[PDB]
């Protein structure tokens, strides 16, 4: 059995002698509740619906002349929220919630568990919300048969000509299932910008929420079966939940003058002190080849180290872009320093190679904020790369064009209003 | 306590690789602050470092425990723009190799974004921080001014045959051997400067061979550094085995 | 002393004048580290001067400019360094690198069109439908009549309705259907004009292996018109094929022209008995079937046919590498997934100047001498470590012994693709296991990085650093035999200098064993056809023909419907 | 408020005075359990894995020479099932089940609720099962590092080169989420052949299971919000669950000598007797234009009539193909007889037009058995067409090439072994 | 020639060829052209194939977000001079010609002379400063009322009307177009603004050209009829109406 002590975003003890099996997506109550709320919560952009109606616009550039309708949607947000709740709920007094946010511009809708239990996916959070607001607006403004199709377009966008609600005003932290690269990727298709916005740019909570979602994705993919359950849970605890305060204390010790390289040296020193690695043999030059006494625990120390190096390097520059090179050179230098494989046996370094390329070239990608566990560039590691990206995005001080304030205003306001999403380390430890 | 070992091997190449990694590099030439600014081409020499101008919604410093314990670099504290220093190094025993310029930056400089490629190596950082790095990248033995060149664009030359004068080809002719010294009279992206920057003498062929971090069959063959070949095979074997079952 | 196979090509491309590059004044010694830089620019190259001249005509005609060599950064045109030609490996053709750009090479475009416009459709389920639902008898006589009808209808001609308008046969003369079968009794009765005879196309051993894998089943090798896939896409092919198969069964068996049994023939042709070239791709790089991204590496090895006509195992594997480097890097990664100037030389590194040939013959000869012969080396990490290290270090040293070799393969990604392909192919041929070859490829990549202190472009080694661990992994999106990997295998989905070389490695284990095919015997037989426009037995020879504007089997042109 | 009496597949009373709201996918406990088991249950084809290993084959035509590993799998089904259970379960004694079926050829795997609760979709039923059987076989035969990739290919097929487990041996009654046409279509992507095989070719139970799944799909799509909830529930009760015995008694009355047309006349007579329709106005010729006194209830009578006509016509011929024309001409003739719109206001008739075309032409489709609620040809009606297709497939006595015995042996055996799937009318009525 | 038969009118059912009923021509409406129905088959009609290629090979890409990246992120000034130089570079590079690297091999301009980029803007002050060779002048192309309606809908924004080579979409597909366009836009910004040829800001220009400021002809299709963007199935009916331009030059509704 494997035990850990969970420490907070500020390096304070929250829970002692925790079996890592009790932190699993399949057993931990807080993680299950986070996933339940991720699937049932959707955002309705009333301000967006109002502008779309007033200008006959669908998305960023489409405009149908002569279809304008000047309806006071935002000024009637409370009235519409009440009707939306009546339409989304299954029974009176059930677990449905509708909350008006951002001065009437948004509605946070949480569909009742009954809609997820009778559906195969999360998509009823989008479809029940979109159908509910479409009907509520048609009723409140007595919209006639000829004009209801414009209310429909203002809410659902180009759907069903497009596979999803392209150019619409109903969205989620999740993307449509058709965008998944493979099986088990829905919880991995969440922009790093969304995570940093939700967690209020607290880098530890950003890494924790991302690590939880990434490992829920790895479990759903079938990458945490048998011996691989221990492998992924050690990574979740040490990288995502600050187990034994290794991430926080490494960052504190290296925060004033540390670099990617000094973080490598600190992690090797700690792994040796804790008995995770030992000298295997000494070469004629004096170079020591090390052996891993516990391969999965060594992997977890390299995952914690990859995050601590991101915090030290991106934190010093207050610049997110350093994460791609940090993940690459922390693991490349770790291998050169010890003779042992880096995090995820070369897959964090490999992910970082393509991620660096696709965040500094003409071919695609973008700034760190656009990447996610379902992105072709950054999917390769088993959940150990995106938590570092989320922390790096949180640490940025105005270097990015496509920042969380630009791409994630709606998701940040809606899901950031939920405490379990804002403070995942505290929530996970408290549910034990 | 822990004494870093950096990299295996016992040849001059392995010793030079550990020098670049540890920052134990000799200073061989001097560049003034204004001449360094001129050749980087980011702002007028002598001028103050410009700042970023992000939108109002991103001005607020968040309550973050990591921001509270990670000290910003001088460049980050001032809000400098992110700028770069990019080098091309000849495979004919230029002291530097792309991966080892990146390891030097990752180990010895804070808040850096190094990138390694075959024909170019880059470091992006907050402008004043990238100039501190840039000064060490050009003044130390990590550079020979003939076998290496600062090139932010049109980098071709690392793998080309040297010119008859021993200088590595540059399609944009930013620097050349002019009357016994290397003169750079264009910035790293080829814009003509209103000055001539003197980068000093080139290394001799013997000095470059003794100081280089590249292996060559006609100098220090890669095959001869047994511990390095062993290290590669060990990383390959352990990555292979753990990818199957991590035990 | 072994004479390196690339020396002759380096002497020609660097020391003999090409255009007006004054090569003898640059350097006459292929081992010299120094060269005289003449900075001739456009004047040295008849090809760049042709482009400059067309650019002037275009700007004048449109009133909107195009090509202009002086718009290169700093007003300095291409050719400050000597512009040299390439020898297409295994040929005496010397050409400009621009002649190997897929846009400028009709043989390359026709190779992709012949793959794109092909599907294989079974006949057994269709014949069973006719027997069960209509009580119709199927005989060689009814099949032969059906094949005559099918070859009239497939290009776009009518067989049932009155007042139909049809495709001009002169625009679709590359369209036809042939058949093959594992039933020797049926094969002897099929009209020879339509048969791909497995016994004639393959040696006795390989023909027996194909027949045992196929069983007594019958298949149609369909090739829809090139003009159709050019106007439309690869996902058109299986639908176009099924429509004309359906019409031909209706007319040849006098069915009702549109009854319930016709829908069973449609479902059989479009889904149950369809064998396409590749499946669809996910949303980010969305495409339907029969696109390069869906083409598994083993399928490209079975499309290529050099192993069917040569006993030279290295040569046969490198013809696969040439087809794959061109298709996967130049057309697929360089256009479908990016575009512009693209990735010609990232691919030409694997099929020019006999360089990959030198490295691969060296590694394979080393393995044959040490382990005994092809497919005799144990499939173990000890064997992979031995062959791949020996081959990689030999290849690494050649760039240092020959400065002209290093200048030719100037990009690190070019060196990485060739060094690692030789290590992987030598390992695969020696062990008869392509997964062992793939493991050797990743070890060679790691050796090259530490040897030169550099590897490829910025993002070159994402899949190589992931690589060693994912060769033998059995995890969900990691594990898979190389034969079934392709450009949609996650680690491989983005980067140049790997995919075509992996097609060669996929072929290597099978070529080492003397196998008739790698992953799909139906694909192997379908492309063992000399009537196809592109000669899949001689990939490099065909690319060389296209380079010098002599490839005379280009399909899909519209000259017949354009003003003279 | 709308009440119904639920009658069995044999026309016997099962439940009286049932509020249709209590039959909703969002409220009915039996429907929620059917969906829960649909999402968590997967089939492992041990017979397929055995042949794939022995011949180095992947799917129907791919074969890699020299990779043959003739492992003895089927005879070891119980030992492998025990190990698969250990790997799929989250905790000892949880709701995981693994059962051997078809003499060792198949395993029915039911993943624990915990895997669905921490995942976004149903896909952990496939991925946990595929990973579990791959690991169990590697262990039982001590498969080495070089050969484990062939065990992986035998189970997962071409994945991840293909989006799903193409040519593999792990499947579900559901298809991958990437195959959905739009939002809420996962429970609609189920072949009519699967339904008919699961329900043992009992036409009433085939229509009931299909109607339940189709209406769960319509609810997840957002097509049962507000007034549309009553609309879809009336269709579910009258067409899917034999409300007031209208389907069964109409089929019994018309079973000996009835046609599509006599079923039209019976339904109009019944709607008039029950007060659902009345004469609106009489034309000079004497032709009576009728009005719908309750539009949604008239729609439900036309949905029940569409099914009863399918049973009478396909039942008489014992031939599934008649369903496409039955759905077309029952509704076309119903409109000509009354002057009122047919089922789904022309969308059942429209679906039937394209369905007839795509089950009798060169262009696509196939026999009735290949269609489903997610098929582009048959998706158009709001769940009122596929239940008739499932009944028609069940009634076929051997005219089809692509029959349930050809396409649905695995699914039919695995899900058909579960009583709620075999007898959905009885199960739904008993949960009230 | 092949030794394998093809078209044969006598292979029509019953050995009876087409034309038992009188074979008649068609008048193309509004023209005096009389032709066989076979002359209107898309395979046999180059005007029809070229109509589809001109749609398939086109995307529209905004310039404002790219210019904002240059100004805010790199502190570079964007002027009519820099824009005009960028457009000359872009029309050289877009067809497949090099602007940064040495020893590049390029497309034959004679094979890609249909490839070019023009620009249009709702900012009249900027329209008067753009190099006229590349401008689509909204006031000249549309009547006074329609030009005002277009400008009010577009606002003060600037766009690139990109047409990649026909030979490229014929060899490849419609989903190639936005990627081909973005690659050469990226190279042209690097060369025209003397950026580092591959720095973090270049990825913002790539994300802007490929995603945030891209206006393609149509989005992807679902699995059963899977295709990427810029295929006919993704072309909305209103987009085809806006592609056609007869209403701009005739008052006959
Ligand atoms: C702007 C980039 C960054 C990016 O995202 N793509 C670029 C440029 C792009 C352009 C260059 C076209 C032009 O000149 O206008 C094209 C052709 C892609 C396109 N858009 O059509 C390309 N690279 Ni690049 N690119 C190449 C390569 C390379 C090598 C060149 C190093 C050298 O010493 O010459 C280096 C990467 C490395 O160092 O490993 C490289 C970098 C770069 N590559 C740097 C520019 C380098 C410079 O400033 O000179 N490429 C190669 O290594 C060989 C193949 C070559 C490709 C063209 C072909 O295959 O024929 C081309 C592939
Ligand atoms: C990453 C992804 O781009 P996006 O991040 O989605 O813009 C992807 N491009 C590529 O992978 C480009 C591959 C070819 C060019 C690079 C060769 S090394 C694509 O367009 O679908
Ligand atoms: C139905 C569907 O075919 P399948 O049932 O999937 O084989 C579909 N074909 C079509 O819709 C054919 C449309 C063109 C021919 C009919 C014109 S009326 C397709 O190929 O994706
Ligand atoms: O320089 S980069 O490696 O980003 C692209 C090379 S084509
Ligand atoms: K095409």
Residue numbers in the entry:
A (entry chain B), D (entry chain E): 2 to 433
B (entry chain C): 2 to 248
C (entry chain A): 5 to 568
E (entry chain D): 65 to 317
Paper text:
MCR is a three-subunit complex harboring the cofactor F430, a nickel-containing corrinoid that gives its yellow color to the enzyme. The chemical reaction catalyzed by the cofactor is a thiyl-radical mechanism in which the Ni(I)-active state will attack the thiol group of the methyl-S-CoM forcing the generation of methane and the formation of the heterodisulfide made of the HS-CoM and Coenzyme B (CoB-SH). In this report, we investigated MCR natively isolated from Methermicoccus shengliensis.
The structure of MCR from Methanosarcina barkeri (MbMCR) was used for molecular replacement based on a phylogenetic analysis and the MsMCR structure was refined to 1.6-Å resolution. Interestingly, while the first dimer shows an excellent fit in the electron density (average B-factor = 22.6 Å2), the second dimer has a very high average B-factor (51.3 Å2), which made its accurate modelling challenging. The UV/Visible spectra is typical of the Ni(II) red1-silent state with an absorption peak at 424 nm. Both coenzymes are bound at very high occupancy with a distance of 6.2 Å separating their sulphur groups as previously seen in other Ni(II) red1-silent structures, the density between the thiol groups was interpreted as a water molecule. The high quality of the obtained electron density map confirmed the presence of three modified residues: N1-methylhistidine275, 5(S)-methylarginine289, and the thioglycine463. Methanobacteriales, Methanococcales, Methanopyrus kandleri, and Methanoculleus thermophilus contain a 2(S)-methylglutamine close to the F430. This modification is not present in MbMCR and in M. acetivorans and the presented structural data shows a classic glutamine at this position in MsMCR. The electrostatic charge repartition of MsMCR fits very well with the one from MbMCR rather than the two other thermophiles showing that thermophilic and high salt adaptations of M. shengliensis have not drastically modified the enzyme surface.
